[PDB]
């Protein structure tokens, strides 16, 4: 999954 705040 993908980091939201980066």
């Amino acid at each position: 999954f993908e980091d939201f705040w980066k």
Epitope: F1, E2, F4, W5
Partner: antibody, heavy 120, light 114 residues
Framework: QVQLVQSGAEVKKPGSSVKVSCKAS????????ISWVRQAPGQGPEWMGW????????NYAQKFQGRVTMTRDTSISTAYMELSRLRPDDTAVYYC?????????????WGQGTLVTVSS | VLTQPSSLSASPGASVSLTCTLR?????????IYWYQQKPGSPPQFLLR?????????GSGVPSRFSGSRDASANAGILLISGLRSEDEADYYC?????????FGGGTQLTVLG
């Protein structure tokens, strides 16, 4: 991925410093970044930076460099944001937030916020 | 960098378009627009993010009547709310990653008439 619980309201004088905490409800923070966002009354959000809870590496917004410090405790249980040389215009609700995304959805985990009041 | 109308009002059941206008030069096609809803006393809650019909992500538990789109003509991202309800009354904020800082719009206060 985990719920975040913040510390209580703070009241400070100009020139002082405040340190807000952001503890994982469950004892351990996740690997995803913990961003810090503040919101002055009647205004919109303002990003301050984030920290990576495993590395401890930071990325501070330009407006707050030299004033803000973001750390983590050694058990990776709690994240901290420290702001120094406070001014009345630092008065705001300070939030921590973390989250992740599928390709279809996103899941944002916000703390309840911590009110920091700066006044003489 | 971002400009939102400070206030917007509409009737229940209406379809409303909330605009997030990016500064001249900053091309709207090269940014993924984030949208948040905030009610008094609560943190912002992520609604959705939109880059194209191809790459769009919906917030957890956010109804489908909230959708995203783009308006390249006006250099603006768009949050579409159909079937407007009284519970949609809130502040709506847009946001982008630009010059390695998260940038937020000033917010649109949405009032439901009647």
């Amino acid at each position: 991925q985990v719920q975040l619980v913040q510390s209580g309201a703070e009241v400070k004088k100009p020139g002082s410093s405040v340190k807000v905490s952001c503890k994982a409800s469950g004892g351990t923070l996740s690997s995803y970044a913990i961003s810090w966002v503040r919101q002055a009354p009647g205004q919109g959000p303002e990003w301050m930076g984030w920290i990576n809870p495993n590395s401890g590496g930071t990325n501070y917004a330009q407006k707050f460099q030299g004033r803000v410090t973001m750390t983590r405790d050694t058990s990776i249980s709690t994240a901290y944001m420290e702001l120094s040389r406070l001014r009345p215009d630092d008065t705001a609700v300070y939030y921590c937030a973390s989250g992740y995304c599928s390709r279809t959805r996103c899941y944002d985990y916000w703390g309840q916020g911590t009110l920091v009041t700066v006044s003489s | 960098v971002l400009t939102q109308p400070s206030s917007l009002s509409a009737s229940p059941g209406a379809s409303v378009s909330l605009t997030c206008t990016l500064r001249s030069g900053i091309n709207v096609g090269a940014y993924r627009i984030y949208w948040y809803q905030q009610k008094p006393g609560s943190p912002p809650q992520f609604l959705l993010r939109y880059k194209s019909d191809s790459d769009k992500q919906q917030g957890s538990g956010v109804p489908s009547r909230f959708s995203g789109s783009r308006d390249a003509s006006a250099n603006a991202g768009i949050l579409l709310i159909s079937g407007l309800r009284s519970e949609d009354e809130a502040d709506y904020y847009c946001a982008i990653w630009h010059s390695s800082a998260w940038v937020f719009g000033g917010g649109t206060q949405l009032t439901v008439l009647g």
